[PDB]
Structure formats: C-alpha cells, structure tokens
Design a protein around this ligand. Sequence first.
Ligand SMILES: NC(Cc1cnc[nH]1)C(=O)Nc1ccc2ccccc2c1
Ligand SMILES: NC(Cc1cnc[nH]1)C(=O)Nc1ccc2ccccc2c1
Ligand SMILES: NC(Cc1cnc[nH]1)C(=O)Nc1ccc2ccccc2c1
Lengths: 144, 143, 144, 144, 143, 143
Amino acid sequence: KERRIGRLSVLLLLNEAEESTQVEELERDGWKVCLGKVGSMDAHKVIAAIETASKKSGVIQSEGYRESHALYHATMEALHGVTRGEMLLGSLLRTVGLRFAVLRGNPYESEAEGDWIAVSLYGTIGAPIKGLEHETFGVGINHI
Amino acid sequence: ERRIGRLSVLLLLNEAEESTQVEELERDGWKVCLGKVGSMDAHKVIAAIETASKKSGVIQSEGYRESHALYHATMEALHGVTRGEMLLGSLLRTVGLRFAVLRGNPYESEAEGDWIAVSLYGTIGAPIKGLEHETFGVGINHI
Amino acid sequence: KERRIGRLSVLLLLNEAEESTQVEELERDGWKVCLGKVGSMDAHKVIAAIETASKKSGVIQSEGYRESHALYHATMEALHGVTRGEMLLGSLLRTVGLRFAVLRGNPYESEAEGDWIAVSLYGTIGAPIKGLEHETFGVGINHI
Amino acid sequence: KERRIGRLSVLLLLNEAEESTQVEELERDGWKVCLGKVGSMDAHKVIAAIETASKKSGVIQSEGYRESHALYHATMEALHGVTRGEMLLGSLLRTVGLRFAVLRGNPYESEAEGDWIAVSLYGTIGAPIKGLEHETFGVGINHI
Amino acid sequence: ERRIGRLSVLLLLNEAEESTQVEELERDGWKVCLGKVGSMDAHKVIAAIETASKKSGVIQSEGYRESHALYHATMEALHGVTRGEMLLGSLLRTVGLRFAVLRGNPYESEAEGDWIAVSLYGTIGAPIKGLEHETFGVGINHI
Amino acid sequence: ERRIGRLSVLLLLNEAEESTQVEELERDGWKVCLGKVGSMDAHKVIAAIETASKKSGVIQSEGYRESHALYHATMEALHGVTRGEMLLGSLLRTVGLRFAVLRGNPYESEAEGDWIAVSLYGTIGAPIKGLEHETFGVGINHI
Ligand SMILES: NC(Cc1cnc[nH]1)C(=O)Nc1ccc2ccccc2c1
Ligand SMILES: NC(Cc1cnc[nH]1)C(=O)Nc1ccc2ccccc2c1
Ligand SMILES: NC(Cc1cnc[nH]1)C(=O)Nc1ccc2ccccc2c1
C-alpha cells in the first residue's frame, strides 16, 4: 500500500462503488475523509460547500483560520484545474455537477513534518449542444 | 455512461495489475498506451507520449489530425501536473511522470466521435525526503 | 483556383460585397454555404445561432448528433479565437456584433477522406471609450 | 531625483501618507496628478471612473479622443495586471477596493518626444474565506 | 469604416495580385509588409516579421515602442495559427506561414492613433497528403 | 494591516537607502532578498532570484515546497514586467530588472501562514535614448 494522500483522494473521488467501505479503510488508517457534491463551478459556491462539508466531518477543526486557510488553497488549485481553459469560454449559466473528496492526514514517509490535505474534484459541464458534456478534473494538495 | 477521461485516470492510479485493465479495455473497443517519463518538460513528455502512442497503435504513425489531438490532450493535462506553470515543469529535477492515453468512442453511437484522453500523474520527489508532492492532469479531445 | 475551405470561408466572411454571387460560385462548386449575425459573444448564444442558421440552409443535416458535433467544435475554435484574450477583460455586458460564414464540402485534394467544415467569425466589440472598437476574428476547421 | 513617471506613479499610489505634499511636489515639477478609488474591478466601471477623475483634474483635456485614448490603453494594461490570473477564478460578485494614481507629464530624458502618462492600481480582492484578502497591482504606461 | 485588421487579412488571402493591393494601400496612407516563413515557432516568426517589417519601413530600424507593438500584434496572431498552443507551433514540421503587417491610422482624425496589424495564414501540410489543415490569426495594436 | 505585497514594492522603488529598510523589516520578522538581473528571460530571472534567495536565507537551500512558492510568486510577477508576454521578455536586449523577495507572516496570528512576495521593477532601455519604458510585477503566494 501507499500513504499517498493525492492518489487516495482521487481514487476515492473516482469510485462510485461502496465509498462506504473505501471510506472506512481510509478512516481506519489515520485518514479523515469527507465527500459531497456541488452544482456550481463558482469559486465562492465551491469553497463554501467544501469548507462546510469538511468542518462537519472533522476533516478540519473550525477553531480558527489556519486549517480553513489550508483547505481554501487546496480547493482553489483543484478548482483552478476544473476551470481548465475551454471552461473559460464555457460560461453562460451552464449546468455543472461537481463531486468531490477531501482527505486529511499524514503522507507519513519517515518524518511527521505535519499533516497534509487533498481536495480532488470531478464533475461534468453541459455543452450548449444536447448530447455532449465535458469532463472536469482538479486536485489540490496542501500542507496544514 | 462511458467516461474516457475518468477511465484513463483510473488506469493511471490502479497499480493493481493494469495488464488486465488494458486488455479489458482493449477488448472493450479502446486503444491504450501506458508509460513513464522522468521529466515534466513539455517537449520531452510529448515526444515520449507520441512515441509510446504510435508504437501501441493508439495513433497512426502519420497524419496531422490525430497527432494534433494527442498534443492538445497532452498539453491540457500538462497544465494540471505543472500546477499552472508549464515553464516550471521544465525546471523540476528529480521527478516522475506516469501517463495514460485512451482513444475511442465516448458513446455507443455509430458516429465515430473518436476521442482521446491523456492522463498524467506526477510525483515530484527529493533526493532525500522522497515524495514531496503529487500532481494530476487530464486532457480530453475529439479526433 | 483552390479548394481551401478555410480560405474560402474567410473571404466569404470578409466581403460585404455581393455575397449573392460569391455564395453562388461556392454552391456551384459543391460547397454548402450559410451566413448570418449575432449580437452575442456568449458561447451558448453563438453555437445556438450557428447550429440553427446552418441546419436550415443544408450545411448540416439535423438527422443526428455527429454532424452537429462537428459544427460545435469548429465554432468553438473560431469562438475561442474571437474571445482572444484582451476580450477576457472586456466582459461588462458590452456590445458585440459578430458576423459569420460556414462552409461545408470537400477540400478535395486527391482523396475524398470525407467532408470538412469551416466556421469563421468577424465582428466588433465596443470599447468602454466612445469612438473605439476592437476587431475580432476566429476560424474553426473540422472534419465531419 | 528621477523623472520616471512609472516609479513616481507607483510611489504616489503606494503611500497613504500626506499625498497632499507628495502630490504638490509632483505638480511643482511639471507633472499633472490625479488619485481616487473604485469598488469595481469591471473594465467598464474602472476606465469610466478613471477617465472622469482624470479630466476633471487636468490630467487630460477632454477636447477630443486622442488623449482619452492614450489613457484607456494605459488603464487597461494596469487593469490587465490587476486581474492577474488567480483573479480570473475569483469572479463571484466578490468585493474589490481599487485605489489608483495617474501621472501625466514628460519623462524628460534629453528629448521631449512628447508626453507620457502612467496609471497604477492597487487594491484588495476579498476571498471567499473570512480573514483573507489578496493584493492586486497593475501599472500602465503610455505615450500621449 | 477603416478596418486595419480586416484589411490585413484580405491582403493575406487575396493572392490575386497584391502588387496592386500593396501600392493601392501604400498610396492610401498605410505601411505594408508581406512575407512567408517556413515555421510556426514563435521566435522564428517574430524575427522574420521583424526583419521584413523594418526592411519595408513598416517600422523604424530602432525604437522599443514600435517593436513592442509589432511583437504583440504578432503574438496575438500566433495564438490563432497555433490553435491556442504556442508551444506546439514550434513542434510542427512541414508548415507554411504567410504574414501581412499593416501600420497606419484607423480613423481619419489628425490624432495619430497609429495602429499595427499582423495577419497570419498557416498551412499545415504533410509530406504526402499535402494540405491537411489551415490556420488563421490576427493581431491589432496601437503604436 | 501587514501588506507583504505592498511592502516588497516599496522596498523595490525606495532607492533611499534600503540598507535601513532591510534591517528595519528583518528585525520586524521578515526575510529579505534584494537583487538585480540584466535580463527578462524567465529562466535567468528565476535562477538569479533563487540563488540570491537562498544565499540570504529567504528560503532553505533545499525543499520543493518553498521553492515552488518562490517560482510561482516570481512567475506571476514576470507576467507583469513582460507586459503579458513572457516569451518576449526573453527577446528584450539591453534591459534591467531589479527584484525584491519578502517571506513572512501576513497577519500577526500564531498560524504560520508563511507568505512570500516577489516584486519586479523593469527598465527597458535603448543603447541611445536610454530609458524607454518601465515595467512592474508582483507575486504573492503562501508557503
Ligand atoms: N490538477 C491540478 C493540480 C494538481 C494535481 N495534483 C497536484 N496539483 C490543477 O488544477 N492545478 C493548478 C492549476 C492552476 C493553478 C494556478 C495557480 C496556482 C496553482 C494552480 C494549480
Ligand atoms: N483563429 C483560430 C483558429 C484557426 C484558424 N484557422 C484554423 N484554426 C482560433 O481562434 N483558435 C483557437 C484558439 C483557442 C483554442 C483552444 C483550444 C482548442 C483549439 C483552439 C483554437
Ligand atoms: N503590471 C503590468 C504592466 C506594467 C507595469 N509597468 C509597465 N507595464 C500589467 O498588468 N501588464 C500587462 C498585463 C497584460 C497585458 C495584455 C496585453 C497587453 C498589455 C498587457 C500588460
């Protein structure tokens, strides 16, 4: 096995099959998990949904700003990717369905320099042509 | 439901035994290329991907059309792995890049609508500490 | 003469002089033509106007998705160009007047590998300064 | 001292201390000055605020289009910078507070080839996370 | 109605006999440069355009100002012809690029408002099949 | 009120006697690097900044993390000074680039929230006319 938070984060995101057990195996291994969905690609809307769904699950303590700040940057990088480029032209109150996953823990290695946190996003953006949707994908790894 | 993009990433991360996954998808109609490059330099990655892509039949040895889609799918994915800074990927020493290419029809219609996806998983390491950061990227284009 | 669909497509677009005869010469040479205008730079608005004006003219059969899909990609490339970059800052419910041209046929050569299709756009984007307008231009060639 | 319009322009912008005297020293040295603020990052909104605050101060004569045109390009470059890139994702009716400075005169050197004009912008963009704001900065130098 | 951009493209495509078009516009107040380069490499194109531009008086042999506008008009147009991937234009072998530069006043006012437009027509060929794709680009900047 | 970005620019323009400003900020908790490069080539600038940055303790001699933030802050600032055309900065001959790096906490909280800002002031000159244009850029990233 590998304690690769990013890899784990994406696999968790990309498997619509028994997240129930896939999540428990992660939680059982020191990882804090958290999943969800958002029908908005809007930065505000996404970092809100995520910050929220994450505090309630224990992925990050709402005690202050530090842990919330680490999550934001991670989410932005991941979002900065979802809004690739051809997704810069696609901006006409279109339909978007992003699903995410957040992992928080320690990509151990040998040194416990601290805790990391991954935020991966996967969704679809409707095309202005019926029967055509584009796949989006973004990941953001940050150090708490 | 036939996500070329999603499929390519999974192939990329599932270090289970792609040998099954490749033949499982190859027999399912797709074209597959799996490789690894020790650089995140735009030019180097493209060349490698391009070589491994033809040598595997994922793309015909000649023809601007298919090559252009590969290149773009690849360029779009490279922007993911170099975290929004193509140029600095050239600057990264001691780095591993695994790539997966998938060419095929996204839907079941007769309409060829042939598409190609390049998925990149980057591991930026350190001569000492080892893995220090991971990077992902994806490119999905029609042929 | 040249059976260059792109070149033809642009000249047709760029000549406000007797499109009547310039169109007939193209139609007479195996090309399917179609022109129009749009006051929107919005992707949705543009690919809609175009898909429409094109099916009605016979540039593409609405029979399915394939031919409509080839037109969309062509239009996006052409639009991806109209929305250059300084047109990424210019986005304040400004005034835009895009004119287009669509050509469909066979850039023959020797092999009839199939049919191509060009979509060229030319228009103006008003500046937030009276007496100043920027010229836009985009072309998208695709294979049916 | 230096007759560097850009340098001067930025220092004027970046000093919330006695612009009163910092402005007079510039006016006393052949420079035409002008400062202000805008709560919008919108191109239209910004080039409007600036064109206005500038004509009223004598930075540019409203007599025609030439001097107004030189100001627009200068403002766009400066704005093109304020809307860096991570400010391309940050676009959800967020809060922005731009402050500016405009200098017009002659970066003398030896030749009076004419008159230049600098437009520098400095402000803050609120983050979708409480207790986090990004700093923006842009400068645009143009020749009247 | 005096579209520098539109004018430059037409000059580029009208292979009628530009010799008339160039003198027809040269006497109409514009500066004109017409050339061809066998590459879509950013650096190569700029250098060529730059040389042909000065050697034709479209721009003074020295002076950062005019050179900067040419470069930008050129860079904006190069993004058109390399279909949104500057870097891959460097990668294209066997390709033709015809270019047209036009410097002059866009309106009739006394206000110099000197502008420059670079128009690019790219032909991406194949050692065999010949022409496989066409690419266009335009750049319009004030001096 | 503790604007790392604003602070770095001021340090860059205030040619008063930074010797005081550097020690005034160094004792105020920040890390400071002040340098000059005779090029606007992305690679050259980064290398210089990188060298001067470590040699000054603004960043640890090793470690992908801090290096990545410097690089990005630097890349964001380079887009300012090359006026939106990274590639053409490489093309500029006879040019001066002064740079300022600042690494430290933006607020007073215990939460490290360590940030780094790169500020660039470019002077594009002419072998004759001298200064012909000035260019500014700024990059602000968290570590
Ligand atoms: N797929 C990823 C990132 C990633 C994947 N694994 C690690 N990082 C993405 O969207 N990255 C990006 C994109 C633009 C950016 C712009 C500024 C800073 C970081 C950025 C990161
Ligand atoms: N003038 C053209 C294209 C062209 C002209 N002739 C052929 N192609 C344009 O706008 N191209 C673009 C721009 C961005 C793009 C981004 C992604 C994919 C294709 C793209 C094509
Ligand atoms: N800080 C500066 C500019 C500058 C500073 N000093 C001189 N110029 C900025 O925002 N520049 C930019 C950015 C994008 C641009 C895009 C097109 C043309 C000019 C551009 C100038």
